[PDB]
């Protein structure tokens, strides 16, 4: 049998498995990059599909 989902039914369950990220995973940190400008503005292609 699969188990009954805890939200399917009205009993309160006080032990639960909460997934949680470890130190290795991180989110929302500002991220660094090497932005690099076009060599000449006249050469830039606005147009093509």
């Amino acid at each position: 049998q699969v188990g009954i989902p805890k939200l399917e039914v009205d009993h309160i369950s006080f032990s639960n498995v909460v997934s949680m990220m470890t130190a290795n995973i991180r989110t929302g940190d500002d991220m660094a990059v090497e932005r690099v400008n076009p060599d000449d503005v006249r050469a830039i292609n606005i147009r093509n599909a």
């Binding site: 292609n45 147009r47 093509n48 599909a49």
Partner: protein
């Protein structure tokens, strides 16, 4: 419009066009008239245009489909409007 003025003008214009190309000896080839005309139309500013300038040969083709595929791959584009 008088036929003489019509003919003289239209002849003058027709003579005015000069589509970029490179003549070759192979008997299988044809010019991709649409794209070269289009590149003329935008004075070769559009990327397909400057393709047509630096590689006129790209317009010549044997398999009809690859005539465009060569342009889509050379330019990386998903389409041309």
């Amino acid at each position: 419009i008088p036929a003489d003025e019509l003919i003289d003008n239209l002849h003058s214009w027709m003579r005015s066009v000069h589509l970029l190309h490179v003549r070759s000896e192979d008997n299988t080839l044809r010019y991709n008239w649409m794209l070269g005309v289009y590149a003329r139309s935008t004075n070769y500013t559009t990327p397909v245009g400057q393709l047509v300038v630096n590689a006129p040969a790209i317009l010549n083709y044997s398999n009809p489909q690859d005539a465009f595929n060569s342009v889509f791959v050379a330019l990386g584009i998903d389409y041309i409007d």
